[PDB]
Amino acid sequence: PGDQICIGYHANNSTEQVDTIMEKNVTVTHAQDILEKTHNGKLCDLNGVKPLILRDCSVAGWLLGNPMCDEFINVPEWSYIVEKASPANDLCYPGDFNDYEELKHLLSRTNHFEKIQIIPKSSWSNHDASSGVSSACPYHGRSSFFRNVVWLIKKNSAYPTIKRSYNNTNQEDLLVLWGIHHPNDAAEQTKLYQNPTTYISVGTSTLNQRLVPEIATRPKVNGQSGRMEFFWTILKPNDAINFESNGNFIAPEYAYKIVKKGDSAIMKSELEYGNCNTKCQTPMGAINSSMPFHNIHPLTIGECPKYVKSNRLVLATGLRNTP
């Protein structure tokens, strides 16, 4: 009999469901997904700057210059570094890298190393800078050695005291590597470096250490039963490093200019380059998303969504939809 007006609300064919405290799977007209769950599964540039992918080399193998890591003899500026879990080409000659992790940390705060010759191998007039070579570090079928560091061995049955010094004349910090050799027994000791008891002394404005070789009988690792122990320091732009040793010294030839310090990272991932580009990278792959969250992997680099462990994050935006 009469005209009427009704108040009502939207409804549609949406199936989007949403959770709240009191009810779960509440179908709604409109929702916004805020959780990213997909990546391209490849390693990419970070804003157009290529990462340093070590393939089968470890950071040590790279810096020390394991002959099987020649791929990296001169690496350009990088955004991040990718290292496999258990790289095959690590220390070809068995041993240790002192404060290795503290060095990897310093690497992750770095984007550019420029290799420079700090002590020419040719300049070792009174020692043998050529037989310092092992089958544990094979190159092209013949015994070789770490390329940035030199295994000085006695010449004409005499090992004169070494007193070499390098003054950093660059404007950059420079990373210097050196090492000490731990022989198997006193015979081998006398065989390689004439003197029976030796030391390696290093001096810097801040550094002062004197390393002495610790002989022991060890199982053979990569054929060798001796060990080589590696050390490092950062030489400030106007500082100098002073080496004095009478044996067992694995001397530096090449050091690294720290050209660009910035924010970087060392990613553990097993995958390789994909020739793509992104603003956000993860160990499982890269992310191109406008979502505020993701559940891919916690360890990321670049402008990223915030990592969260959810399988699902959905905001209700519309209202309760009617069946």
Binding site: I5, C6, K306, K309
Partner: protein
């Protein structure tokens, strides 16, 4: 919900109404039709959009995990470091998941409130010039043309204008 309107005394939404969240269905001699209440709809769009943006803004200073490596005699601090990273991830996951639940609920009740309030906006205008059917509809005690309908929608209903036309229709029945 909390406000009794959506899925309450107004049982069900309108598939037919498609240009808004809340609105009107009229039916007179000139014809019937759906029309969306733009102001109250826009107001919600403003509210929910700010809400989504404000949740996203509050989560920008979130924790970001960093790779750190340790050796075989640094197991205590390795474990401390993993416990801390997991600690914050768990804290921040909880924070997001709960905030989403809480605001999802409030967003649904918000809509319920917007509808219940729109219903009251009309009810408080029409008064005894129309009868509450009890299902979201008002049956008029007079003739309401398209021009009358547009007045109710924009809050300009003149109660005394029809009071007498309405009064007559109340008492003969």
């Amino acid at each position: 919900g909390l406000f009794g309107a959506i899925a309450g005394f107004i049982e069900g939404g309108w598939q037919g109404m498609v240009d808004g969240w809340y609105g009107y269905h009229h039916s007179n001699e000139q014809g019937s039709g759906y029309a969306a209440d733009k102001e109250s709809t826009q107001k919600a769009i403003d509210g929910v959009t700010n809400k989504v943006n404000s949740i996203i803004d509050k989560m920008n200073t979130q924790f970001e995990a960093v790779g750190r490596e340790f050796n075989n005699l640094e197991r205590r601090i390795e474990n401390l470091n993993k416990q801390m990273e997991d600690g914050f991830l768990d804290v921040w996951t909880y924070n997001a998941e709960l905030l989403v639940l809480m605001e999802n609920e409030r967003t649904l009740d918000f809509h319920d409130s917007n509808v219940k309030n729109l219903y009251d906006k009309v009810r408080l205008q029409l008064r005894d010039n129309a009868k509450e059917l009890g299902n979201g509809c008002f049956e008029f005690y007079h003739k309401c043309d398209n021009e009358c309908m547009e007045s109710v929608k924009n809050g300009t209903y003149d109660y005394p204008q029809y009071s007498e036309e309405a009064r007559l229709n109340r008492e003969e029945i």
